[PDB]
Each structure stands twice: as structure tokens, then as C-alpha cells.
Design a binder for this molecule. Structure first.
Ligand SMILES: *CCC(=O)N1CC[C@H](n2cc(-c3ncnc4cc(OC)c(OC)cc34)c(-c3cccc(OC)c3)n2)C1
Length: 311
């Protein structure tokens, strides 16, 4: 057959099964809460995040599309849907990520993030994105705000509100309209509404730059209108102060014009894993050693553990 059957299970949760405890956020999406989910008949309590909206027919369709994608993913670096609650306003239930988004975590802990953390997050994001490539899914919205922090040692990719799955032979995705985040998009996406896994790599590059700059806004002050122009000339984001040319060289490769010349997510896992084995050699951070967030063979330079070598 053309493609494999998606036998994932969509779990439906009774409103009684979970207790809403506090409001976490409220924005463009709607309203996210912190809660606890006690599966009936079990002696278990699960810290969860709940998303509800305001009832529009197109709004529910978008929520259910995100639910379809989140329910089909199973990876340590991807957020998974626990279930949906079908009350008058539909509720999505995910695992609580206590530390919130990575963009607000780097901004808040700017003077306590060591090179070992930055490089470990780059590896973890590349692992989640590579798993999404294996599952023929193109995210289309990879950014530091769409990466959650379970613990400072473990992050996961979220926000499947724009993600499109690809058919076994379909290699590109031809979008038509909608509010798209311009400062993270590949040049093909801006000019021709084309999205591949290689356009995700471009957004991975911008995400890494956001982390290396501790939350700086890309192309700050410059409007979306002339951002396409700047990229066409040959201008890219500047080299973050803490970055050695090795780290910045990888970012610049993510931003090539030829999508096929950009690195693959499996290559990004290898490169950043090598760097995480000697972090102070690739990121120069003011007081790198005194920071805390809550060899038998000859040349150990290109040594990579098999768990990071994926084909
Ligand atoms: C900085 C990022 C941000 O504000 N976002 C809001 C919309 C996006 N998002 C985040 C979550 C979410 N998921 C899990 N745990 C969270 C914990 C938080 O604080 C402790 C938190 O604070 C805002 C957000 C968390 C969700 C989300 C929640 C439930 C379901 C669902 O999708 C089906 C997504 N969305 C990033």
C-alpha cells in the first residue's frame, strides 16, 4: 500500500477525570491551564496542561488537526497528547512542562545557562525534528517559543498547529495563506510557500541563534516586508558573541539558499553531540564553570556514541 496505517489511539477523557488547578497562559491560541489527571480506577495522578478556547466551527477543526498530529507522535523530544475532552469547548490534554517555553527560560536564566545546557538542547531539538522527518511530518513553525522545558536537562518540541504530513511520494508542501512566522522561514517558504524537512532546518538554525543569543529577537526592528529582500542579497543573522566559528558555521549552513546544501537533522545530531562532549571549546561563556540549573582511545574528537548515530 501507498503508506502505513496510523494505528495510534486517541484517548477521550471525562471532565470528572481531571481537576483544573490554575491558569498558566492566555493568548492568540486561547487559555492554557495547569491541572491533574487522575485516570479512573487507577492510583495515579498526572500533572497535565489543558488547552481550551469562544466556539467557532473553523477553530474546532484546527484544534482537532493538532490533536490528530500530537496523538500520532511518540518520542522523548516531542510533546504527546494524553487525550481530548469533548465538552461544549474542546480541551486538549498534554503533559505539564513545568518550566514553560525555552524562549522565556533562556531570557529568565540568562546568567546561569552553561554551554553544556545550550549544546544539549541543540542535540535534543535535532533528535525531535529528526524523528518528525522519519514520520514524514514537516513542522512549519519550529522556534524557541515552540520548545517546552520538562526539566532544564530535557526539552520537547510542541505546537503542531501548522504541521503537515507528507504522502509517500509528495516531497514539498504547497501552502496558500495564513499568518506565517516570517523571521524563522526559509527563503523558498517566503517566496514560493514551499515547505520541506530542509525548510525546517532553516528554522532550526534560527532557533539555535535564539538560544545562543539568550532570547534575542531575530532581525529586531526590521519588518517582515523587507526580510525576504535581506536574505536574497546574502545577509544572514550575526554571529552570537558566545559562538565559536564552529557553532556559527553550522547555523550559516542551515541558512543556505540551496535547501539540499543545508544539513540533515541526523547530521545536526552528530555535530552538536561532538560539541557537547567538550562544551567549553565551542561556546565561550562568561563564568561557564560556576553555574547550576535545577577516554581509553587516542583521538576522542570525532567519537560519537551510537545512540546519537541514526540512519
Ligand atoms: C512561551 C510559550 C507559550 O507561552 N506558549 C503558549 C502556547 C504554547 N503552549 C505551551 C503549552 C504548555 N504545554 C505544557 N506545559 C506547559 C506549561 C506551562 O507553564 C508551566 C505553559 O505556560 C504557558 C505552557 C505549557 C501549550 C499546550 C497546552 C495544552 C495543550 C496543547 O496543545 C494541544 C498545548 N501550548 C507555547
Amino acid at each position: 500500500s501507498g503508506e502505513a496505517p496510523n494505528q495510534a489511539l486517541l484517548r477521550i477523557l471525562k471532565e470528572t477525570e481531571f481537576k483544573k488547578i490554575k491558569v498558566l497562559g492566555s493568548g492568540a491560541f486561547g487559555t492554557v491551564y495547569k491541572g491533574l489527571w487522575i485516570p479512573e480506577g487507577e492510583k495515579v495522578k498526572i500533572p497535565v496542561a489543558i488547552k481550551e478556547l469562544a466556539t467557532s466551527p473553523k477553530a474546532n477543526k484546527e484544534i482537532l488537526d493538532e490533536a490528530y498530529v500530537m496523538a500520532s507522535v511518540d518520542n522523548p523530544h516531542v510533546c504527546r497528547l494524553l487525550g481530548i475532552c469533548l465538552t461544549s469547548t474542546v480541551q486538549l490534554i498534554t503533559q505539564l512542562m513545568p518550566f514553560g517555553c525555552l524562549l522565556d527560560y533562556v531570557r529568565e536564566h540568562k546568567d546561569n545557562i552553561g554551554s553544556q545546557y545550550l549544546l544539549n538542547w541543540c542535540v535534543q531539538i535535532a533528535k525531535g525534528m529528526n524523528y518528525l522527518e522519519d514520520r514524514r511530518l514537516v513542522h512549519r513553525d519550529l522556534a524557541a517559543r515552540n520548545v517546552l522545558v520538562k526539566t532544564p536537562q530535557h526539552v520537547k518540541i510542541t505546537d503542531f498547529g501548522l504541521a503537515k504530513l507528507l504522502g509517500a511520494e509528495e516531497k514539498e508542501y504547497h501552502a496558500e495563506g495564513g499568518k506565517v512566522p516570517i523571521k524563522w522561514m526559509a527563503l523558498e517558504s517566503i517566496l514560493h510557500r514551499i515547505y520541506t524537512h530542509q525548510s525546517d532546518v532553516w528554522s532550526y538554525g534560527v532557533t539555535v541563534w535564539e538560544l545562543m543569543t539568550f532570547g534575542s529577537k531575530p532581525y529586531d526592528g526590521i519588518p517582515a516586508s523587507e526580510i525576504s529582500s535581506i536574505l536574497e542579497k546574502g545577509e544572514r543573522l550575526p554571529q552570537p558573541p558566545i559562538c565559536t566559528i564552529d557553532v556559527y558555521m553550522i547555523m550559516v549552513k542551515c541558512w543556505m539558499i540551496d535547501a539540499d546544501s543545508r544539513p540533515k537533522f541526523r547530521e545536526l545530531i552528530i555535530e552538536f553531540s561532538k560539541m557537547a562532549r567538550d562544551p567549553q571549546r565551542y561556546l565561550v561563556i562568561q563564568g561557564d564553570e560556576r553555574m547550576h540549573l535545577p577516554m581509553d582511545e587516542e583521538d576522542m574528537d570525532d567519537v560519537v556514541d551510537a545512540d546519537e548515530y541514526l540512519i
